[PDB]
Amino acid sequence: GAMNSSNYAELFNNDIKLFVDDTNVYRVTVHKTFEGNVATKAINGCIFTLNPKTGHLFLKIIHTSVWAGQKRLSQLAKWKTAEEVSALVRSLPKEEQPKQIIVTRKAMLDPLEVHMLDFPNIAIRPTELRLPFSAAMSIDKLSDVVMKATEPQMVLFNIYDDWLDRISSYTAFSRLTLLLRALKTNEESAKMILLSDPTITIKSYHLWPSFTDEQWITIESQMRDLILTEYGRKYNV
Amino acid sequence: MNTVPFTSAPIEVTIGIDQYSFNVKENQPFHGIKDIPIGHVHVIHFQHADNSSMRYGYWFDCRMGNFYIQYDPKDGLYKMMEERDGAKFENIVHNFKERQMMVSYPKIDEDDTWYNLTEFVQMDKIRKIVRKDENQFSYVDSSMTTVQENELSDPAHSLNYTVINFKSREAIRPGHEMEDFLDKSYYLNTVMLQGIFKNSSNYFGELQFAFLNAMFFGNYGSSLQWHAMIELICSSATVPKHMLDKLDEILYYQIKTLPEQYSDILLNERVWNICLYSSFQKNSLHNTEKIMENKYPELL
Numbered sequence: 001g002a003m004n005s006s007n008y009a010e011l012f013n014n015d016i017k018l019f020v021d022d023t024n025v026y027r028v029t030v031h032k033t034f035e036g037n038v039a040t041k042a043i044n045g046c047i048f049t050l051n052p053k054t055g056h057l058f059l060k061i062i063h064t065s066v067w068a069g070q071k072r073l074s075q076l077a078k079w080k081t082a083e084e085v086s087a088l089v090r091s092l093p094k095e096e097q098p099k100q101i102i103v104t105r106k107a108m109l110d111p112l113e114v115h116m117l118d119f120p121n122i123a124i125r126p127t128e129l130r131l132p133f134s135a136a137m138s139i140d141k142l143s144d145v146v147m148k149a150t151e152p153q154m155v156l157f158n159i160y161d162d163w164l165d166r167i168s169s170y171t172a173f174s175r176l177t178l179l180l181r182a183l184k185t186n187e188e189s190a191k192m193i194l195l196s197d198p199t200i201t202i203k204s205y206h207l208w209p210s211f212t213d214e215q216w217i218t219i220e221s222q223m224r225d226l227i228l229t230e231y232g233r234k235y236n237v
Numbered sequence: 238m239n240t241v242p243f244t245s246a247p248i249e250v251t252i253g254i255d256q257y258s259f260n261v262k263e264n265q266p267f268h269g270i271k272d273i274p275i276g277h278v279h280v281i282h283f284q285h286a287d288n289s290s291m292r293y294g295y296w297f298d299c300r301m302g303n304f305y306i307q308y309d310p311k312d313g314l315y316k317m318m319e320e321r322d323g324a325k326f327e328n329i330v331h332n333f334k335e336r337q338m339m340v341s342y343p344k345i346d347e348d349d350t351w352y353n354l355t356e357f358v359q360m361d362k363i364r365k366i367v368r369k370d371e372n373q374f375s376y377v378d379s380s381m382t383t384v385q386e387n388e389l390s391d392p393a394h395s396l397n398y399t400v401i402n403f404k405s406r407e408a409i410r411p412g413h414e415m416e417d418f419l420d421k422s423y424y425l426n427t428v429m430l431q432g433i434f435k436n437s438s439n440y441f442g443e444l445q446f447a448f449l450n451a452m453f454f455g456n457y458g459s460s461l462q463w464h465a466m467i468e469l470i471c472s473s474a475t476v477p478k479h480m481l482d483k484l485d486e487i488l489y490y491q492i493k494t495l496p497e498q499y500s501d502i503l504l505n506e507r508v509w510n511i512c513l514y515s516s517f518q519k520n521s522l523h524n525t526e527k528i529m530e531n532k533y534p535e536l537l
């Protein structure tokens with residue numbers, strides 16, 4: 001059934017499992033027309049498909065041409081997501097295919113279940129966790145590859161950089177969700193924290209800065225403060 | 238007009254015959270039911286006074302043989318049997334009629350209810366859903382499970398309704414996943430109508446039989462089947478116009494006949510709200526929507 005705080009360490013066991021987040025698949029800007037009506041313009045999007053054990057991210061870029069001439073795009077986007085996830089699974093060797101796929105939004109359950117009928121042994125699960133994967137487009141290198149795409153494309157990343165050399169996947173996921181939660185709550189401040197010190201750089205082959213263990217503790221503390229702050233600035237506390 | 242005699246009535250029981258019912262007291266001199274209309278299937282059903290658990294009954298068609306009821310004190314129920322000696326049977330019935338020990342099937346002349354509930358129901362199809370080939374009649378009870386229920390446990394005692402499953406490879410063409418799931422016309426028209434049922438008459442007959450088993454026996458898997466067969470039509474954008482018109486009539490008479498007090502358990506809120514108000518056919522069931530809104534507005 002659903003994934004929650006009770007069964008949380010199941011994410012970090014050796015069974016292959018993927019989270020799928022569809023919140024950046026169909027993206028639009030809303031604007032006025034010359035006649036003073038409202039219209040939307042789609043921009044490139046992405047499926048965020050992640051292994052929480054290894055950190056491997058399968059970023060399927062959704063080019064705006066896939067929407068041309070189609071109706072009911074928000075509904076189509078869920079089906080397109082499930083089509084692409086199914087295609088990804090079929091492309092993987094049997095021993096790399098997931099035993100579970102956890103969708104971050106319950107509206108993905110039926111589309112994914114229908115597209116995965118050929119895989120009856122892969123469990124399709126919701127979650128009660130409120131995960132901040134929508135903020136993936138606040139990671140500069142991910143946003144850059146999505147916006148630059150001129151055609152459909154899959155790009156593979158490790159969202160943990162080299163962290164697993166020094167920390168466990170439980171701790172790496174906790175750091176990732178803290179960073180993304182911060183970027184979601186106050187992107188400007190979060191990004192200031194991450195780059196304020198120009199002597200700490202992002203390696204060409206990485207997504208985040210090359211912090212030492214001690215610097216990550218400072219960074220992590222700064223992100224918690226930011227989240228608590230904004231939570232006050234929000235509710236006034 | 239045909240007759241189903243009873244050897245005796247040794248235990249107190251409520252006896253149904255189609256939509257009618259009457260109480261028989263323990264050892265009351267009751268010897269059966271006469272004046273049963275020829276041309277229709279019928280159901281004779283039982284609920285014991287001491288154990289309302291297990292409503293049970295027998296589907297039959299008097300054109301196919303001479304049938305009677307006899308209580309079995311070992312198995313503890315009223316059993317239908319066939320009498321092969323036609324002269325013995327005629328002689329039995331005539332004696333019981335002369336002594337006026339039979340109830341008359343109490344059909345009002347104006348009244349087409351039973352026809353309207355059984356229009357497409359055929360004994361030959363009932364006998365494929367309920368498999369017991371040595372008898373010409375079919376036993377059903379409250380507890381019998383369906384083939385689909387068993388997939389999710391005695392096979393000989395199952396209701397072999399046609400399995401409908403909207404999230405199945407049968408229902409969903411590879412490469413048409415979204416199309417087939419949101420518009421079930423393929424599954425309805427090619428898979429089920431052309432492929433399995435052959436025609437809409439057989440589809441409606443199974444739908445009507447499922448409803449009647451749900452209503453008369455409280456058979457839960459039958460209720461599931463009835464709703465699934467409605468939903469499959471309503472969730473199809475492309476349905477022959479004669480089928481939609483006939484479905485509206487079928488459902489109208491089913492809703493009309495349902496006991497007002499059993500609507501809570503026999504009607505699935507989700508299916509009916511979807512069918513009447515959201516589905517492709519939301520505007521095609523005028524008679525059914527009107528009776529539902531006036532009789533069960535709470536459900537909606």
Ligand SMILES: NC(=O)C1CCOCC1
Pocket residue numbers: 013014015016017051053054
């Ligand atoms: N759970 C995984 O994705 C990996 C962990 C160990 O290497 C092979 C499977």
